């Protein structure tokens, strides 16, 4: 009910440290496969943690 909102901008977002880690039990991307995350740029990204 108090979900966070953190802005992400002007950076590089390599996922070889995130997706390759076995800790993240749940990882479901509803728009693309996790592989294509690095090969495509992005825009203003909001980091919402709960």
């Amino acid at each position, epitope marked *: *009910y*108090a*979900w*966070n*909102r*953190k802005r992400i901008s002007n950076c590089v977002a390599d996922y070889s440290v995130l997706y390759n880690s076995a800790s993240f039990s749940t990882f479901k991307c509803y728009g693309v496969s996790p592989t294509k995350l690095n090969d495509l740029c992005f825009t203003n990204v909001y980091a919402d943690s709960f």
Partner: nanobody
Amino acid sequence: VQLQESGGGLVQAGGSLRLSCVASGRTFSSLNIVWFRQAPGKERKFVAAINDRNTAYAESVKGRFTISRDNAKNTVHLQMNSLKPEDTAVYYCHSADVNGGMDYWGKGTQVTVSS
């Protein structure tokens, strides 16, 4: 940064206290104050919550509890009256912005009621 809380003390039953919640930040008005206590050996339950000028209290804490905010000094008071032994617990103040992010938790202050 851990929040600083003060204003509690060991007094007899029916006493009064004034708990304080202190945080650093110019947006102290846009945040919210929520109170939670854990009785010794018992589960933590709801205490109090204030939303700007709004005041809400639970089933067994209404009437006795009264919370007011002084957002200019970055200090929110939690006035206490008619302490009872079932209220003997350590109180923590919770911070939540308009969305609920950037939350902070502090050591808190010890509140004890003597019979």
